[PDB]
Design a protein around this ligand. Structure first.
Ligand SMILES: [Mg+2]
Lengths: 297, 296
């Protein structure tokens, strides 16, 4: 009934070289995701350091994602959120214009809208495009929570709104959502609990770990969607150590560190206020990484 | 260090037909000036900085500087960002337009580490030569500037002279001033204005003063005169309005109160902010009846 974007999805890191987006590396990383079973890529989300990219760089990375996924089954679910509704509408329209298959739209950060404000915020976004819109709830970062009732109202009232990427450590809410609106696409935004969310009827993940181990996250998700819960849980259990250490510091500081340690990106560069991890954390990530196979290019 | 302290107002930004009501904006600032306020903070959190365009940001700062010219009232311009390159640009811009200093909120959403926060604010401080007030509000940003990081920034960077705390953490307020008594601690939470001042805080950046500038200014000046009995008296009297003004997320209640008092023409916000619930509207209206609201 609704057009959806589900399955194993990757919140792409944005590699920097000499303070600019390494556009070749970016395309190479997306191709590596495609070749390891990923179903969709999320350019310029939180893991992609959307906050510190210019509007032009925002467009460059979405376009590279769109162009790299052409001729494949992999879709582009472009990050396009804002805590200003007029800007979120503009970003949604840009992402559509750029060939995105849908948008991921984070709940307004910092200004703490009410549930009524969130409803009007996302309705305005939904009314701006004709492509699928996935809500994104991460209260630890935004200071706000999209209630289950607000999500279900948006799902029922807006054709393009088809689900939510939950990063809230709240499996109760995941039960709440799918028990009252079983038609929505619940997407895990927290790698450590990928399997419990999938096993409750979630239909995908938007993963940080998949930057480093796309084949494992892909296999986990597809096992779960095929109702092979025993095989899905084993991979989820296997990934717990890496899933946790990748948040030793604020994402994407650890995942970019791991990608650099694996030789998958050429420079450990961030955009301030993000910075390199502590020495202690650098070493801890390297230690956890040694227990996993990291696919190359 | 050059400082900006005393009674300060986080100015609301009135909208009329979807645009900044610049006449209303200037008129509200004059009312603040005539009511004993020492500085105004354009386009802070209470001013809906997040939903203003870059031009609206420039325009309200210009109106503030320019309206306070020839008065002793200073302009502490909101200029923070969660991208350091942008926060540097906003700081340089604010300096260029005659602001006396800047309020720079800790990066929201992307949760920098303490090292990143230090480098973030270090870059800002070195880009201008006007005072820089840190702004810690972890409930909104998802990050905390630790006491150690604030003190390091105060000691390492000339322009950084203090912090506006909106953290409900009087322990931290003791921590800050016991280890670095030279910094200017500024209250960002109206209900506890007096406890912060009585511990050596040197000012407030107030939401309530939009509605009751004379009372907040008088409270602050009593406290700075070490008339703690009178400062506390006002703080106690203001608790009810101070509390109801956060019934919903600021500035939803304060704009509701300004509208109810006849001080602004329309209860307009920019999405994702919206009108309060019918219930909250009525609660704000009821609490207000116990306070005397200065007109224009
Ligand atoms: Mg305390």
């Amino acid at each position: 009934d609704k057009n959806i974007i589900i399955g194993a999805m990757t919140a792409l890191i944005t590699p920097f070289k000499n303070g600019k987006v390494d556009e070749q590396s970016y395309a190479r990383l997306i191709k590596r995701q495609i070749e390891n079973g990923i179903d969709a890529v999320v350019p310029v989300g939180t893991t992609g350091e959307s906050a510190t990219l210019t509007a032009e760089e925002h467009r460059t990375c979405i376009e590279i994602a769109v162009e790299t996924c052409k001729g494949t089954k992999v879709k582009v679910l472009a990050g396009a959120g804002s805590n200003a509704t007029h800007e979120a509408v503009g970003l949604a329209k840009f992402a559509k214009e750029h060939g995105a298959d849908g948008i991921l739209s984070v709940a307004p950060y910092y200004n703490k809208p009410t549930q009524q404000g969130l409803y009007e915020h996302y309705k305005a976004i939904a009314q701006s495009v004709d492509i699928p819109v996935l809500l994104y709830n991460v209260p630890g970062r935004t200071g706000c929570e999209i209630s289950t009732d607000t999500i279900i109202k948006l799902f029922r009232d807006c054709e393009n709104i088809y689900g939510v990427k939950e990063a809230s450590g709240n499996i109760d809410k995941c039960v709440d959502l799918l028990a009252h609106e079983p038609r929505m696409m619940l997407i895990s935004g927290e790698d450590a609990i990928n399997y419990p969310i999938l096993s409750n009827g979630g239909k995908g993940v938007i993963s940080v770990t998949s930057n480093l181990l796309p084949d494992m996250i892909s296999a986990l998700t597809h096992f779960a969607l095929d109702e092979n819960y025993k095989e899905a849980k084993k991979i989820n259990d296997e990934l717990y150590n890496i899933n946790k250490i990748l948040f030793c510091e604020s994402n994407p500081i650890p995942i970019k560190t791991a990608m650099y340690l694996a030789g998958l990106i050429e420079s450990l560069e961030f955009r301030l206020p993000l910075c390199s991890p502590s020495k202690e954390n650098f070493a801890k990530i390297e230690e956890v990484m040694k227990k996993y196979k990291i696919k190359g290019f």
